[PDB]
Amino acid sequence: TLRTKEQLGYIVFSGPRRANGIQGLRFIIQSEKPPHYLESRVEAFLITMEKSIEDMTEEAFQKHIQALAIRRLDKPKKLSAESAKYWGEIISQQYNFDRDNTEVAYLKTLTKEDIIKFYKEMLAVDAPRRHKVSVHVLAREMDSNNLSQAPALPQPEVIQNMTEFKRGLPLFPLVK
Amino acid sequence: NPAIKRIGNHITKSPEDKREYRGLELANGIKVLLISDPTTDKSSAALDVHIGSLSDPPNIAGLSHFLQHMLFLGTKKYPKENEYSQFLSEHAGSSNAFTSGEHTNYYFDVSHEHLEGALDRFAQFFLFDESAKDREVNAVDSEHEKNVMNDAWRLFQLEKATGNPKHPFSKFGTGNKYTLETRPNQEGIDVRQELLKFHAYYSSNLMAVVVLGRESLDDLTNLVVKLFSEVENKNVPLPEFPEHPFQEEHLKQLYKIVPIKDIRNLYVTFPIPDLQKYYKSNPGHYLGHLIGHEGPGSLLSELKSKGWVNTLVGGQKEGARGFMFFIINVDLTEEGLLHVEDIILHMFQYIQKLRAEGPQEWVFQELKDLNAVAFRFKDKERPRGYTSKIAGILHYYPLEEVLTAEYLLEEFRPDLIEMVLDKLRPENVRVAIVSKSFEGKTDRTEEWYGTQYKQEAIPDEVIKKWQNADLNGKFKLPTKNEFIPTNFEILPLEKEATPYPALIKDTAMSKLWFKQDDKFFLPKANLNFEFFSPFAYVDPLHSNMAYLYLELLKDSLNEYAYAAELAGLSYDLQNTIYGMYLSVKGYNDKQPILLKKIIEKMATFEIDEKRFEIIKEAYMRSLNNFRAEQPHQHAMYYLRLLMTEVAWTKDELKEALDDVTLPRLKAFIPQLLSRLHIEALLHGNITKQAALGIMQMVEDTLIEHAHTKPLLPSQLVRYREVQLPDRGWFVYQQRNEVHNNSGIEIYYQTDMQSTSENMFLELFAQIISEPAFNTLRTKEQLGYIVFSGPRRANGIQGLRFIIQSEKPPHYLESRVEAFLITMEKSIEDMTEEAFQKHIQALAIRRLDKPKKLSAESAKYWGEIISQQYNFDRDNTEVAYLKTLTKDIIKFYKEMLVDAPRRHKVSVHVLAQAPALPQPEVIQNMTEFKRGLPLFPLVKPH
Amino acid sequence: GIVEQCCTSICSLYQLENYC
Ligand SMILES: [Zn+2]
């Protein structure tokens, strides 16, 4: 959608972001168009993905579950890869060396309703616990400041100083 | 007036004192003093009796203490037990009382518009339920039990018991459950009848009252006459004790005492006649000034240079109307404990030097002028303590000199001084050594406190060595004090003066707040400074090196700064989790000079290795001696560690203390002074250009000698408070290995520090204050120490209960919860007039203006450390407080048993109630902090 | 340097609700 169809940019990434024991979903896009237009396209893509999950069949849903199980249970091909996994589990201080088996065994139990409620609770535009942070990087020449329908977005709080942004916010605990 | 026997002519007061005074003596013998102040927000009153605990019956020890305890639980005209404290609490007032061997002083304060309403009942106190007695016995017993493991109490009662046992000085003044309840019940004594028959000594001829209020002297006169003319006069003679409790068989004796804390002290005592009647000269204050001196050529200078003593105290100690003492107490190093005989020998060498030189009229004159200046420019005291002090000293001095007797010296008589010096002789000495090295070498036990000690006779050979003491060249008379202020000029108020502190300088090096004194107009100043540096609290090693650096600095500057400290110019220098803290307070005449000297010693410090080892060992003894603190203090400490993000325990500091070395410290001082921030608050009798000159002086000295560079703003890291989860209860449990009593601290946490939440918490704490005291202490008699109030730290607040009791902390906690439900029902059934009465009481509590300069500068500094800079907080928060309604119920349902956001943490220090959930025991503080979130920081202004 | 106002243990105010 974001590369083959709309042709925003060459680099389009999306996936899980884990750091300091806390996680979230991340999208990374580099393009020529302004970041606000890019962000509207990302939101419209998010609603399109909501309708896609809603209209998704159980066989394809089980196909995604199985594909994620294959990606999670992919055995390391070399000693530096296995030691990279173990060293990740050590640096994270979670020490869950049997993580793949348990997380896949629980992955085969999830349901489309669980996914829908998760999206509507954490990722929707009107979600009660939405935690959104956007980083915009303008182009070089940009001075200082048939497509789907984009939803109405609230007024964002522009950050002036990172330290001031952090002092007024709480901190998450560590993973036991 | 017929009810007034006489009226004083005029009260000798200071020309700077705007309060009005009028002294008089009623027909019944009560010595009355009246103080009119039309500007005070709270009035006060105090009544003093001159009997005390030395007149207790021989079979009932502590009867006057128990009576003082008992007079607060209702009278004839007002029989309810806590109607007095409930009235004062509902009218923004408080009360208390103490009982010394020759006094029993009651005192209280209240709002200025209900002085008569409280004073009527306070007069009913002096014009006994069985259940109230049986209950309060446990409060007295918990008081004595609180005072059992206290070293000062142990040595005090041991000094009482080592004298003549037949003398009343040997009596036990506190009393306990045995002497008040168990023994009288075993001997068929009616304690209530003893209270009624003792309340033969509470005569009007031995009473001194002091009343301070906004009303006129005539209204106060008619009030005190009306309410106190009915006090019956029984003409009780004042008790005197001409025979000294220390006879010959008690003199020239050595007492080896084993303490609880690991302390090393030496006590020298000389029995002397009562010098009270010599208040016009004060030879005990003269000889105390010379002997206890700390400047060059003093005794403490030699005792410090020899590495035997660190601190010395010497002067006159009050005994009674017939006997007094003259004491010299010092601290002992590991070498001083073995050279006690040599230390005492140097003491008698200094005394012999004073006998050889003779009295010094120039020293007496210097003390006279210094005390005259310090008295003339004395800060305005608080009404309660002021009325209590004057009421206490009214029995000793006439009405005209009651305000200036203990302060102003007028006549110089050397016969008295030479007589006391003749009394300071080895044949009239008493020596007591306190050290742990006497453990297992004692054979005697004190009865009341169980103190282990040993009694020996001082060898006549040692006494002879003391008698042949020659003159020491290291002992010289102190020189002329160069810190005596001579410039009392009040700088005129600048046109740009601000009612609140203003930010007149904000650079990368420092941040300077300044305000010219516009309320007190006294020639004084408070100069506060805070030095931020991340190496101060980075780890226990660097924190220990910082405390050792500051302690070595103050110890090195003590001899030089003792003259300025004696000249009304004092300073405090303490380490904080954010960096150093230096405060210079006093007369601004010679303030910048001494301040410059202190900075010079900060940037040119040369560490002595002997002082380093002695002070290091002393700090080790302190961290070791924290285990003997009281259980509630341990609870506050543990709660502090739990709630703060970063905090090093005294076990970590104690373990890291052994790794501190002199090269590490000498390499650590310039590392600390290499990168600094400065936040200053200059508030006093100085101008803006003077404040800028002082600040620039400090900066230029620090840069010149220490090469100090400013800090990066991103390095200004404040600490957050641990955020408790919703409906979460955590309990940390430890044991107290010293006291046989248990402590407990319950803490409920709130969201943050905003106006609404502050007034919610403060209003609720105002409603539950007196009910908490009365329910947890007066009725149930859990313990002697019961406290409840708001707790603020790191910009987050909450409610805290602190109880010290014998009963287990789980029972105490269940009773706390049941009390919470009881207060829920009480507030739900409370009337709007009582609610608004608590609103008004809190408004008067918060809008109370500071009486002296140091309190105002302390409020400003309190608003600076929190980095909220809300100087108008009182007006805004009270203006919002008067708009609150019986919100408090929803606040109680939201933050305080089944609340959806209940945050509860309990600290249990080992020695109908609702059902409580299963608490999560805290095994490790670090895991506790890692598993829980942190609160944000309060935004700056 | 000199004995000050109530440096002994004699000062026993009935209740401590004014400290800290
Ligand atoms: Zn008491």
Residue B152: which of C8, C14, C17 has the nearest Cβ? C8
Instruction: Evaluate whether residue B297 is within a structural domain.
Output: yes
Query: Which bin fits B215, alpha (ψ -120 to 50), beta or left (φ > 0)?
Result: beta
- Other CB atoms within a 10 A radius of the CB of residue B673 amount to 22
Q: By what method was this entry solved?
A: X-ray
Is there a single domain that holds both residue B418 and residue B536? Answer: no
Residues 6 or more apart whose CB falls under 8 angstroms from that of A76 comprise A82, A84, A85
The Cα–Cα gap between B885 and B876 comes to 17
Helix axis angle for B191-198 and B130-146, nearest 10°, is: 90
CA distances B796 to B17, B152, B205, B749, B845, Å, are 40, 37, 54, 8, 21
The Cα–Cα gap between B734 and B494 comes to 57
Structure tokens at B811: 């029972």
Is there a single domain that holds both residue B449 and residue B556? Answer: no
Q: Are B285 and C2 in contact (CB < 8 Å)?
A: yes
Q: Domain boundary at B238, B254, B287, which?
A: B238
Is there a single domain that holds both residue B183 and residue B257? Answer: no
The Cα–Cα gap between B851 and B54 comes to 36
The Cα–Cα gap between B369 and A42 comes to 83
C19 CA: distance to closest CA in chain B (Å): 10
Is B931 in the A-facing interface, judged by CB distances under 8 Å? yes
Structure tokens at B12: 């000798």
Binding site feature residues of A for ATP: 74-80
Is there a single domain that holds both residue B823 and residue B845? Answer: yes
What 3-state DSSP class applies to B33?
strand
Tally the C-alpha atoms within 13 A of residue B503's C-alpha that lie toward its C-beta: 10
Exposure string over B714-733, b if 16+ CB within 10 A, otherwise e = eeeeebbbbbbeeebbbbbe
Contact present, B633 and B583 (Cβ < 8 Å):
no
Q: Are C11 and B98 in contact (CB < 8 Å)?
A: yes
The Cα–Cα gap between B155 and B2 comes to 50
Structure tokens at A58: 């159980």
Q: Domain boundary at B191, B215, B238, which?
A: B238
Which residues on neighbouring strands pair with residue B579, listed in sequence order? B532, B576
C15 CA: distance to closest CA in chain B (Å): 7
Structure tokens at B125: 């106190």
Residue C1: which of B98, B313, B316 has the nearest Cβ? B313
DSSP assignment of B221-244 = HHHHHHHHTTSPP--PPPP---S-
The Cα–Cα gap between B634 and B85 comes to 29
Contact present, B283 and B420 (Cβ < 8 Å):
yes
DSSP single-letter state for residue B732: E
Helix axis angle for B460-467 and B340-357, nearest 10°, is: 40
The residue ranges of every structural domain in chain A are 1-176
CA distances B516 to A72, B532, B587, B855, B876, Å, are 70, 25, 14, 15, 23
The Cα–Cα gap between B657 and B576 comes to 18
CA angle A80, A81, A82 (to 5 degrees): 95
Structure tokens at B793: 């730290």
CA angle B622, B625, B626 (to 5 degrees): 95
Helix axis angle for B650-657 and B609-625, nearest 10°, is: 150
With residue B709 as reference, give the H or E element that holds it.
strand B709-710
Count structural domains, chain B.
4
Residues 6 or more apart whose CB falls under 8 angstroms from that of B645 comprise B719, B720, B721, B722, B794, B929, B934
Residues 6 or more apart whose CB falls under 8 angstroms from that of B572 comprise B581, B582, B583, B585
CATH code of the domain containing B538: 3.30.830.10
CA of B99 to the centre of ligand 1 (A): 7
The Cα–Cα gap between B679 and B510 comes to 6
**Helices marked H in B626-687:** 631-643, 650-657, 662-672
The Cα–Cα gap between B803 and B812 comes to 8
Query: Which bin fits A73, alpha (ψ -120 to 50), beta or left (φ > 0)?
Result: alpha
Which residues on neighbouring strands pair with residue B382, listed in sequence order? none
Judging contacts by C-beta atoms under 8 Å, the chain A residues touching residue B931 are 173-174, 176
Tally the C-alpha atoms within 13 A of residue B350's C-alpha that lie toward its C-beta: 27
| Torsion angle (degrees, nearest 10) of CA B764, B770, B774, B775 | 0
Is there a single domain that holds both residue B819 and residue B907? Answer: yes
Residues 6 or more apart whose CB falls under 8 angstroms from that of B873 comprise B863
Residues 6 or more apart whose CB falls under 8 angstroms from that of B93 comprise B42, B87, B108, B109, B110, B111, B114, B118
Instruction: Evaluate whether residue B423 is within a structural domain.
Output: yes
The Cα–Cα gap between B314 and B285 comes to 9
Is there a single domain that holds both residue B233 and residue B247? Answer: no
Which residues on neighbouring strands pair with residue B530, listed in sequence order? B581, B679
Subunits adjacent to chain A (3 or more Cβ pairs under 8 Å)? B
From the list B742, B746, B757, the residue with the least C-alpha distance to B789 is B746
Instruction: Evaluate whether residue B482 is within a structural domain.
Output: no
Structure tokens at B834: 């009582």
- Domain span at B556: 495-721
B294 CA: distance to closest CA in chain C (Å): 7
Is there a single domain that holds both residue B280 and residue B345? Answer: yes
Amino acid at B466: W
CA of B157 to the centre of ligand 1 (A): 17
Amino acid at B134: D
The Cα–Cα gap between A165 and A57 comes to 43
C5 CA: distance to closest CA in chain B (Å): 10
DSSP assignment of chain A = -TTTTT---SEEEEEEEEETTEEEEEEEEE-SS-HHHHHHHHHHHHHHHHHHHHT--HHHHHHHHHHHHHHHTPPPSSHHHHHHHHHHHHHTT---TTHHHHHHHHHTT--HHHHHHHIIIIISTT-TT----------SS-----PPPPPP-------S-HHHHHHTS-B-----
Structure tokens at B648: 């090093």
Is there a single domain that holds both residue B387 and residue B280? Answer: yes
The Cα–Cα gap between B382 and B41 comes to 11
Residues 6 or more apart whose CB falls under 8 angstroms from that of B174 comprise B61, B62, B65, B140, B143, B144, B147, C12
DSSP assignment of B110-154 = EETTSHHHHHHHHHHTT---HHHHHHHHHHHHHHHHHTTT-HHHH
Contact present, B169 and B163 (Cβ < 8 Å):
yes
Residues 6 or more apart whose CB falls under 8 angstroms from that of B147 comprise B153, B174, C9
Amino acid at B421: L
Is there a single domain that holds both residue B134 and residue B255? Answer: no
Contacts of the segment B75-79: beta carbons below 8 A, 24+ positions apart: B75/B121, B75/B124, B75/B125, B75/B127, B76/B124, B76/B127, B77/B121, B77/B124, B77/B127, B78/B121, B78/B124
What 3-state DSSP class applies to B682?
strand
CA distances B928 to B108, B602, B605, B636, B798, Å, are 44, 39, 41, 17, 19
CA distances A125 to A115, A149, A154, B148, B921, Å, are 16, 14, 9, 66, 41
The Cα–Cα gap between B31 and B54 comes to 22
Tally the C-alpha atoms within 13 A of residue B212's C-alpha that lie toward its C-beta: 26
Q: Are C2 and B174 in contact (CB < 8 Å)?
A: no
CA distances B204 to A129, B207, B229, B234, B334, Å, are 73, 5, 9, 7, 54
From the list B759, B779, B725, B755, the residue with the least C-alpha distance to B920 is B725
CA distances B593 to B50, B274, B587, Å, are 47, 42, 12
With residue B289 as reference, give the H or E element that holds it.
helix B283-291
Q: Are C1 and B288 in contact (CB < 8 Å)?
A: yes
CA of B97 to the centre of ligand 1 (A): 7
From the list B797, B771, B763, B770, the residue with the least C-alpha distance to B888 is B763
Residues 6 or more apart whose CB falls under 8 angstroms from that of B754 comprise none
Contact present, B595 and B565 (Cβ < 8 Å):
no
From the list B452, B459, B457, the residue with the least C-alpha distance to B436 is B452
Residue at token pair 């004790």:
B241
From the list A99, C10, C12, A38, the residue with the least C-alpha distance to B97 is C12
CA distances B386 to B281, C12, C15, Å, are 24, 17, 19
Exposure string over B852-862, b if 16+ CB within 10 A, otherwise e = bbbebbbebbe
User: How would you list the strands of the sheet with B207-213, edge to edge?
Assistant: B4-7, B20-26, B31-36, B207-213, B42-49, B103-111, B94-100
Is B450 in the A-facing interface, judged by CB distances under 8 Å? no
Which residues on neighbouring strands pair with residue B323, listed in sequence order? B273
Instruction: Evaluate whether residue B163 is within a structural domain.
Output: yes
- Other CB atoms within a 10 A radius of the CB of residue A148 amount to 14
The Cα–Cα gap between B184 and B189 comes to 5
CA of B449 to the centre of ligand 1 (A): 18
CA of B205 to the centre of ligand 1 (A): 24
Judging contacts by C-beta atoms under 8 Å, the chain B residues touching residue A171 are 720, 933-934
Indicate if the alpha-carbon torsion angle B923, B924, B927, B931 is positive or negative: positive
Indicate if the alpha-carbon torsion angle B306, B312, B315, B318 is positive or negative: negative
Structure tokens at B608: 């002595």
Q: Are B293 and C1 in contact (CB < 8 Å)?
A: yes
Is there a single domain that holds both residue B218 and residue B249? Answer: no
Q: Domain boundary at B662, B692, B721, which?
A: B721
Is there a single domain that holds both residue B748 and residue B623? Answer: no
From the list B27, B15, B229, B117, the residue with the least C-alpha distance to B837 is B117
Structure tokens at B894: 């939201």
The Cα–Cα gap between B92 and B112 comes to 10
Indicate if the alpha-carbon torsion angle B411, B414, B419, B421 is positive or negative: positive
Residues 6 or more apart whose CB falls under 8 angstroms from that of B738 comprise B149, B260, B627, B628
Contact present, B346 and B466 (Cβ < 8 Å):
no
CA C6 to chain centre: 6
Instruction: Evaluate whether residue B509 is within a structural domain.
Output: yes
Which residues on neighbouring strands pair with residue B254, listed in sequence order? B431, B456
CATH of A1-176, one of 3.40.960.10, 3.30.830.10, 3.10.310.10, 3.30.43.10: 3.30.830.10
Contact present, A53 and A113 (Cβ < 8 Å):
no
Contact present, B698 and B677 (Cβ < 8 Å):
no
User: How would you list the strands of the sheet with B312-317, edge to edge?
Assistant: B312-317, B323-331, B265-273, B430-434, B253-257, B452-457, B444-445
Structure tokens at B792: 């603020």
A5 CA: distance to closest CA in chain B (Å): 43
Which residues on neighbouring strands pair with residue B209, listed in sequence order? B32, B47
The Cα–Cα gap between B771 and B256 comes to 47
- Go through chain B and list every residue after which a break occurs, taking a C to next N gap over 2.5 angstroms, comma-separated: 127, 199, 886, 896, 911
Exposure string over B265-293, b if 16+ CB within 10 A, otherwise e = bbbbbbbbbbbbebbebbbbbbbbbbbbb
Contact present, B632 and B743 (Cβ < 8 Å):
yes
From the list B412, B448, B380, the residue with the least C-alpha distance to B16 is B380
The Cα–Cα gap between A9 and A32 comes to 7
The Cα–Cα gap between B344 and B433 comes to 11
The Cα–Cα gap between A1 and B315 comes to 91
The Cα–Cα gap between A2 and A17 comes to 20
Judging contacts by C-beta atoms under 8 Å, the chain B residues touching residue C3 are 288, 313, 315-317, 327
Is there a single domain that holds both residue B564 and residue B712? Answer: yes
DSSP single-letter state for residue B291: H
Query: Which bin fits B407, alpha (ψ -120 to 50), beta or left (φ > 0)?
Result: alpha
- Other CB atoms within a 10 A radius of the CB of residue B800 amount to 21
- Other CB atoms within a 10 A radius of the CB of residue B842 amount to 22
Q: Are A173 and B931 in contact (CB < 8 Å)?
A: yes
The Cα–Cα gap between B111 and B40 comes to 9
